[PDB]
Design a protein around this ligand. Sequence first.
Ligand SMILES: [Zn+2]
Ligand SMILES: [Zn+2]
Ligand SMILES: [Zn+2]
Length: 84
Amino acid sequence: RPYACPVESCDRRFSDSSNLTRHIRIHTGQKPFQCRICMRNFSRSDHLTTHIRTHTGEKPFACDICGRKFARSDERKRHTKIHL
DNA sequence: AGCGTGGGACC
DNA sequence: TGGTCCCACGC
Ligand SMILES: [Zn+2]
Ligand SMILES: [Zn+2]
Ligand SMILES: [Zn+2]
């Protein structure tokens, strides 16, 4: 991996450039995105998008078997396996 | 179940 | 740069 985190004793190498800057926000504690509803700060925009659904109750991901809806894709993925 | 949060890969 | 899905780990 071309990109390396220059923060002391942190051995993380990333391949994508944007992923390095994303990872750097962990060490710097920077949180560029805020939630308009609860005013909480997040390090990432994609986590903010899914966080907002905890307020609005929006669930765009439905299980193909029973039709149960979830706010995030991974929750639906983890759910679908129960029907096995 | 609910959801913060990090990583790969992508546009 | 600035996001934007998919997905895994943690409690
Ligand atoms: Zn680092
Ligand atoms: Zn909020
Ligand atoms: Zn189901």
